[PDB]
Write a protein that binds this ligand. Structure first.
Ligand SMILES: O[C@H]1[C@H](O)[C@@H](O)CN2CC[C@H](O)[C@H]12
Length: 394
């Protein structure tokens, strides 16, 4: 359904839909604030559902699932010249641990989205974004500050959930829409046992192929250096239809944030050069236009921004307030953003393509493809360039 050798992925992630993220839909978390006190705001979906109780959580989520993304969004995505969406979903949509507070019902909408994709000629990756115990401690895994995916029976439960996903979406029924199943979003390499993570990836790969599926297996790079996965799941060992997903950002440390615009561009170009040397097909499954970490709660509920020296002991660079609203951005910030977007697009089209995080947010402009496109900062058509050939690719 896709030619990874000759076609280029031009897509968007459908984040904030099946896995709640406070920075993407702050309206669902803000009612828990007491005046200016954020100490009682649930920090992730686990605590949000637990605090509300099953009845209220299901009532609020049904409304969210039925309105956040609809068929109209798929038509708009196609109309903008995109050909692909990545869909994050948590393990709890398929299986609950004993005592899990989560509610289910996401699968009905996932299945509606696959039909909307088919009707609009859009291809999809299904991405298991949160595993039991958490594979990274981020709020977007469902459970913040916990790193227990490799403890107890959590790896085994994850493989069981993947088997369910393999049988439902890796077979003939969706072979014209599903062009990859991503085994696990952003496992945090540095805090995990890498030998056990490789075994899990291999077990997932073998389990999918054993069902008779020919669907591409997508493995996230686990924050390893470029080339790390070159010798894993290789054609020499009869392992095939494998894609590496690289996520690329320059906002999660003081050093990255302090770079001037030219150095931000040089780094983006280098991502393209280095990905070209890898031996597996690869796609930039996440990236954005952000040059700051100013979006409210991007680092988590009750955490500030490094950009204004309010988090991670980073030095003050600039005030975030003036950057929260795209209408208040200076001409220089608008130009810098457009340059940054174009360099990234050129670098990612140099290999398998790109998937912007994300399609929409309630009010964080750096992270919304819709907002950036409507304000003229994201090229439309996507091949348009106001700053051509910043990287000099051959
Ligand atoms: O929203 C999250 C997404 O859920 C994760 O896969 C990590 N991404 C990295 C940038 C931002 O944190 C974004």
């Amino acid at each position: 359904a896709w030619d990874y050798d000759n076609n280029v992925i031009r897509g968007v992630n459908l984040g904030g839909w099946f896995v709640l993220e406070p920075y993407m839909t702050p309206s669902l978390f803000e009612p828990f604030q007491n005046g200016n006190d954020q100490s009682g705001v649930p920090v992730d979906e686990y605590h949000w559902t637990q605090t509300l109780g099953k009845e209220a959580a299901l009532r609020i989520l049904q409304k969210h699932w039925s309105t956040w993304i609809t068929e109209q969004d798929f038509k708009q995505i196609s109309n903008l010249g995109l050909n692909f969406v990545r869909i994050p979903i948590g393990y709890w949509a398929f299986q609950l641990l004993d005592n899990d507070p989560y509610v289910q019902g996401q699968v009905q909408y996932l299945e509606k989205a696959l039909g909307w994709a088919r009707k609009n000629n859009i291809r999809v990756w299904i991405d298991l974004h949160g595993a039991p115990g958490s594979q990274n401690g981020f709020d977007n895994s469902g459970l913040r500050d916990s790193y227990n995916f490799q403890n107890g029976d959590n790896t085994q439960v994850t493989l069981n959930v993947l088997n369910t996903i393999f049988k439902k979406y890796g077979g003939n029924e969706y072979s014209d829409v599903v062009i990859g199943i991503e085994l696990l979003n952003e496992p945090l390499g540095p805090v995990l046992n890498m030998d056990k993570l490789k075994q899990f990836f291999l077990d997932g790969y073998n389990s999918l192929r054993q069902t008779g599926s020919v669907t591409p297996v997508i493995i996230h790079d686990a924050f390893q250096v470029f080339g790390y996965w070159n010798n894993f799941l290789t054609v020499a060992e009869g392992q095939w239809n494998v894609v590496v997903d690289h996520h690329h950002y320059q906002v999660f440390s003081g050093g990255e944030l302090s770079r001037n615009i030219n150095d931000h561009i040089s780094v983006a170009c280098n991502w393209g050069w280095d990905a070209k040397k890898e031996s597996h097909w690869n796609v930039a499954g996440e990236w954005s236009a952000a040059l700051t970490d100013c979006a409210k709660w991007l680092n988590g509920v009750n955490r500030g921004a490094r950009y204004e020296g309010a988090y991670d002991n980073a030095p003050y660079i600039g005030s975030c307030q003036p950057l929260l609203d795209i209408s208040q951005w200076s001409d220089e910030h608008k130009t810098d953003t457009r340059r940054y977007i174009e360099a990234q697009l050129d670098a990612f089209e140099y290999t398998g393509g790109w998937v912007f995080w994300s399609w929409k947010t309630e009010n964080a402009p750096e992270w919304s493809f819709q907002t950036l496109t409507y304000n003229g900062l994201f090229p439309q058509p996507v091949t348009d360039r106001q700053f051509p050939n910043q990287c000099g690719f051959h």
